Amino acid sequence: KESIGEIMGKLMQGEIGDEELSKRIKEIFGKRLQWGYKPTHQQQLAFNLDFIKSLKEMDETYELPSAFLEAAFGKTIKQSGCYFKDETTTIDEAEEASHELYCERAQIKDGQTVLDIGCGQGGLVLHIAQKYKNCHVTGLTNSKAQKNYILMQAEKLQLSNVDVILADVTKHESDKTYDRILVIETIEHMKNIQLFMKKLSTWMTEDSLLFVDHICHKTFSHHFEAIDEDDWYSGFIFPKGCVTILSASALLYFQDDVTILDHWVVNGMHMARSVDAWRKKLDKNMELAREILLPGLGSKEAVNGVITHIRTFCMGGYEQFSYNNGEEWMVAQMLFKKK
Amino acid sequence: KESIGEIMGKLMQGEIGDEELSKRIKEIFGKRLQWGYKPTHQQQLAFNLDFIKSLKEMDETYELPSAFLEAAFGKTIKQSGCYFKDETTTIDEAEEASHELYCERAQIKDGQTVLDIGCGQGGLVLHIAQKYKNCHVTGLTNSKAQKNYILMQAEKLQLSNVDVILADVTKHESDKTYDRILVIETIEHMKNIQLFMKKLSTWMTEDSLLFVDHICHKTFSHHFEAIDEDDWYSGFIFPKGCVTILSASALLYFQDDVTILDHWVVNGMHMARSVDAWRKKLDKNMELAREILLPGLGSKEAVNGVITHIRTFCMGGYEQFSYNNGEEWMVAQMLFKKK
Numbered sequence: 001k002e003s004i005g006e007i008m009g010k011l012m013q014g015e016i017g018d019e020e021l022s023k024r025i026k027e028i029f030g031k032r033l034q035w036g037y038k039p040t041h042q043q044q045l046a047f048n049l050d051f052i053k054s055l056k057e058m059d060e061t062y063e064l065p066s067a068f069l070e071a072a073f074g075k076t077i078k079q080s081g082c083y084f085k086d087e088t089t090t091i092d093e094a095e096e097a098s099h100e101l102y103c104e105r106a107q108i109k110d111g112q113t114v115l116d117i118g119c120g121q122g123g124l125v126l127h128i129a130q131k132y133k134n135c136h137v138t139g140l141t142n143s144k145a146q147k148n149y150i151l152m153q154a155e156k157l158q159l160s161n162v163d164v165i166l167a168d169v170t171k172h173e174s175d176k177t178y179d180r181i182l183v184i185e186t187i188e189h190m191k192n193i194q195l196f197m198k199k200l201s202t203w204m205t206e207d208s209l210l211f212v213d214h215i216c217h218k219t220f221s222h223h224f225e226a227i228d229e230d231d232w233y234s235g236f237i238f239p240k241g242c243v244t245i246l247s248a249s250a251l252l253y254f255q256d257d258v259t260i261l262d263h264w265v266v267n268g269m270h271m272a273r274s275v276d277a278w279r280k281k282l283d284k285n286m287e288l289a290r291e292i293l294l295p296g297l298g299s300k301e302a303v304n305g306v307i308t309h310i311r312t313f314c315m316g317g318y319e320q321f322s323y324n325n326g327e328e329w330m331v332a333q334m335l336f337k338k339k
Numbered sequence: 340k341e342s343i344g345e346i347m348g349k350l351m352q353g354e355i356g357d358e359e360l361s362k363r364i365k366e367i368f369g370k371r372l373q374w375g376y377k378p379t380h381q382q383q384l385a386f387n388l389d390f391i392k393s394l395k396e397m398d399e400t401y402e403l404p405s406a407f408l409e410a411a412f413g414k415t416i417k418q419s420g421c422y423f424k425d426e427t428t429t430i431d432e433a434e435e436a437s438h439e440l441y442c443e444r445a446q447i448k449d450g451q452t453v454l455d456i457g458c459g460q461g462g463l464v465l466h467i468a469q470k471y472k473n474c475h476v477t478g479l480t481n482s483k484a485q486k487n488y489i490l491m492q493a494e495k496l497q498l499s500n501v502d503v504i505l506a507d508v509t510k511h512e513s514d515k516t517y518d519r520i521l522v523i524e525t526i527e528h529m530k531n532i533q534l535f536m537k538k539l540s541t542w543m544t545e546d547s548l549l550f551v552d553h554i555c556h557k558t559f560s561h562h563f564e565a566i567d568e569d570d571w572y573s574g575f576i577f578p579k580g581c582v583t584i585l586s587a588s589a590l591l592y593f594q595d596d597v598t599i600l601d602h603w604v605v606n607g608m609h610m611a612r613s614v615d616a617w618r619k620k621l622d623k624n625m626e627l628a629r630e631i632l633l634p635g636l637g638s639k640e641a642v643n644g645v646i647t648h649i650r651t652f653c654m655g656g657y658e659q660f661s662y663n664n665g666e667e668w669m670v671a672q673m674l675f676k677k678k
């Protein structure tokens with residue numbers, strides 16, 4: 001029986017081949033499926049409702065250089081599941097296709113005020129601003145680096161209809177309302193979902209729509225964390241308490257302040273193809289990445305550490321989202337109006 | 340290839356043995372499962388949401404003698420799924436166990452005002468009234484015979500806290516509010532669910548709870564009707580447009596006016612054991628039943644017809660609810676508060 005430290009050591013030293021790494025991670029996810037699936041729908045619902053009840057009771061300086069993100073991710077540095085029509089769809093095309101899918105499903109129209117919560121590097125903000133010149137598009141992020149990157153891109157693209165709010169969304173106070181609120185793979189990070197949804201509703205009028213996209217499991221919810229002491233992966237990728245994977249249906253139970261209008265899922269192979277593209281691009285640009293990171297990180301060892309973390313995230317994400325041809329973990333999307 | 344009329348003829352003449360009848364009905368339900376299950380969760384949700392959207396767009400003198408109902412059903416003439424703890428649980432015990440389950444899940448407490456919508460022969464009304472003497476319990480039914488039966492039973496049981504409203508619930512207008520509203524296997528008959536839920540909410544205060552129990556399929560919704568021309572069963576049991584079988588999750592999408600607090604399902608073997616008990620009791624009391632019905636129906640042929648209808652309902656219900664050990668069709672229950 002090998003220890004966590006032992007596996008972690010080989011991992012950090014690049015001694016685990018891709019085939020073995022994939023196999024180890026796939027077995028960890030396998031155990032999560034065993035944990036989450038119950039024998040009867042009666043038991044499945046009891047389990048799911050206990051999770052949802054638990055949620056309702058629940059009341060940092062280092063950032064990657066932009067050149068590094070540019071070398072690993074797609075053109076707009078989307079950090080969320082993309083959408084791949086064809087076998088030959090590139091990550092750049094898949095980003096744009098995802099942006100268009102969100103615009104369709106969130107019913108974006110020219111002239112609307114749009115808020116994007118947890119806007120990342122602002123791919124969606126910039127997409128909407130460029131496509132709908134009479135929209136005013138606000139991104140909200142807790143990262144100064146992200147804000148600065150978005151404002152620079154808007155300037156380069158001659159977009160005059162973009163602003164960015166620098167704020168922790170859980171603390172942000174405002175009387176401003178928006179026609180459209182978008183939340184793309186941000187809710188997974190929210191500690192208090194009920195409060196979050198209530199806050200969003202106060203930023204809506206009776207004409208507004210709220211669109212949420214979140215990674216999910218089709219059947220059950222779980223915190224992203226180790227089940228047992230054999231799981232070296234989960235806590236390596238994310239600290240405890242950071243990420244929650246809701247079931248595809250979980251948000252249906254959070255309609256205190258908003259009302260569902262539509263509900264979709266996107267098969268997990270799209271996410272799998274996304275992380276695969278990132279991993280391959282990082283691999284191709286490995287030497288450049290190491291060069292970019294070295295100044296800010298201080299040693300080749302610290303560099304190798306950051307790279308190992310990102311690359312393993314991609315390798316593991318591949319196994320998670322591709323499990324059973326995309327029919328386990330996937331992406332859920334929901335459209336809401338205000339009550 | 341045999342016609343519907345041909346199968347119907349043999350059925351009415353008692354020429355189809357139980358084994359063949361069961362097999363024919365089980366194959367009809369099998370085809371419904373093929374119709375309702377989709378290959379991917381993406382497709383399953385598209386199918387389910389299309390059904391729920393369809394619902395949101397949607398805007399007689401003959402009654403069985405009480406002696407007949409008494410000879411076929413359990414002691415309180417419950418016409419809904421019962422709950423069987425043991426292999427030897429009788430239908431009378433299973434009725435009482437169901438009543439207690441509803442009281443627990445609907446959080447009934449002494450002193451509350453309670454409304455039971457579509458109260459049937461009033462088993463639940465009488466149970467609550469007897470167990471909680473400071474509750475005032477109102478049943479609502481569209482049947483004069485049911486109203487009369489309940490009032491007679493309340494008089495015999497020395498219950499002074501029961502009233503019955505004779506009304507079509509879809510037309511009933513009142514400013515009265517109730518602490519608890521119960522809807523046991525009535526919503527399956529409602530043509531406009533959104534309007535129904537909205538009306539119920541107007542009969543609630545901020546302190547009220549609404550408990551709904553409905554037959555369901557765990558995965559998909561369907562109208563109860565023939566898929567094809569080979570289905571002689573569905574339209575024999577119920578006229579087109581009469582009964583809707585919602586998925587176990589369907590009502591989650593109907594929270595415009597109420598908000599979910601809890602959600603359960605009860606495995607289908609409970610319903611199966613219920614209809615099995617009714618069928619066996621009817622069979623045992625067959626000669627008596629024929630005697631009771633003859634005056635009101637006018638001929639042995641009309642009698643045989645009514646009996647065949649009820650008995651086939653039970654035989655078919657057995658195959659439906661027992662399918663895959665109760666893990667296809669079953670009973671859903673939900674608890675709501677008002678928005």
Ligand SMILES: COc1cc2c(cc1OC)[C@@H]1Cc3ccc(OC)c(OC)c3C[N@+]1(C)CC2
Pocket residue numbers: 078079080081185186188215224243271275313317
């Ligand atoms: C459980 O695994 C997942 C976790 C989650 C995510 C994806 C996951 O697997 C593919 C998403 C998308 C994602 C993509 C690139 C990044 O890498 C730098 C990310 O980090 C900022 C994220 C973080 N998000 C938005 C939340 C958690």
Ligand SMILES: COc1cc2c(cc1OC)[C@@H]1Cc3ccc(OC)c(OC)c3C[N@+]1(C)CC2
Pocket residue numbers: 417418419420524525527554563582610614652656
């Ligand atoms: C699709 O099949 C079902 C249909 C439904 C029901 C049960 C079903 O199968 C077991 C329920 C329960 C039931 C029990 C005894 C009766 O028989 C005389 C009934 O009729 C008044 C009903 C009608 N309910 C309440 C609605 C439709």
Ligand SMILES: Nc1ncnc2c1ncn2[C@@H]1O[C@H](CSCC[C@H](N)C(=O)O)[C@@H](O)[C@H]1O
Pocket residue numbers: 077078079080117118119120121123140141142143146167168169170183184185186189
């Ligand atoms: N409490 C909080 N307040 C504001 N932004 C937050 C936040 N917690 C996380 N975030 C932001 O939420 C985003 C999550 S990653 C998704 C980014 C973007 N929606 C995309 O699709 O690429 C990041 O921008 C992160 O900085």
Ligand SMILES: Nc1ncnc2c1ncn2[C@@H]1O[C@H](CSCC[C@H](N)C(=O)O)[C@@H](O)[C@H]1O
Pocket residue numbers: 416417418419456457458459460462479480481482485506507508509522523524525528
């Ligand atoms: N529009 C309507 N208004 C009022 N009652 C209705 C109705 N449509 C159906 N009903 C009643 O709803 C009931 C459905 S059967 C279930 C009866 C009872 N809840 C039990 O569990 O035994 C019957 O009482 C039927 O008469």
